[PDB]
Amino acid sequence: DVSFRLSGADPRSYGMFIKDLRNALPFREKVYNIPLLLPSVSGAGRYLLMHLFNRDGKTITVAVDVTNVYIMGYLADTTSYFFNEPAAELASQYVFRDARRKITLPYSGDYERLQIAAGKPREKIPIGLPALDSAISTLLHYDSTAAAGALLVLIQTTAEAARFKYIEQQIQERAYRDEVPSLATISLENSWSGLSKQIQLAQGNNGIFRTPIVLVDNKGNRVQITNVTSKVVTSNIQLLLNTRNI
Length: 246
Ligand SMILES: Nc1ncnc2c([C@@H]3O[C@H](CO)[C@@H](O)[C@H]3O)n[nH]c12
What we know:
It is built from 8 helices and 10 strands. The protein is an alpha+beta fold. The structure holds ligand FMC.
């Protein structure tokens, strides 16, 4: 299990938690030196448990599917909450079996539903380590609108920071003050699947992408990734999604 404690978290310890998280996921191969996430796992072993403590030391356990880094739901002392989606219902079979109550959130765990539910698009929700602490605290007592907002912060500061070193760096910049995510990071978040596929499709095409992944990222708008020498490949993306899951 990976843990993090916001109390006395500087940028180093976050980075260290994020390295752990990355490290708890299994992969067999590395494609172009990036870990290729297994195409599937079976059992409770498909699920990684994150223990997250806020500043007062209250904790939620979050459950992450290790095949795609997808947050399934979590446990707040005796209650578990899962998303309203099939994978999340399957997960419920293997995790938090000892909770005294199981609530299904009114929404699935994808961004479009979570933003709708929360009233703000991702671009207008501050993220940082102070936000995450807030987010943890919200989650500790049920409010389905407040949770949509915290879950949006929660996904971005754990799962998306695992996937991309850039985003893990943004959050380090925000260890003591929150700030809305950059276009660059909304773009990276959305393109993980596209990127993942093309990096794999480039083995046996000479590191060349069959289709070029255009990021807004940091060319202000409209960058285009076309082969694997690009920095988003060489230095940014940290975890690959298996093409069996795309
Ligand atoms: N509940 C969740 N937990 C982790 N990641 C996601 C995502 C991510 O949004 C992007 C797909 O368009 C991709 O990174 C998918 O992994 N949406 N919801 C998520």
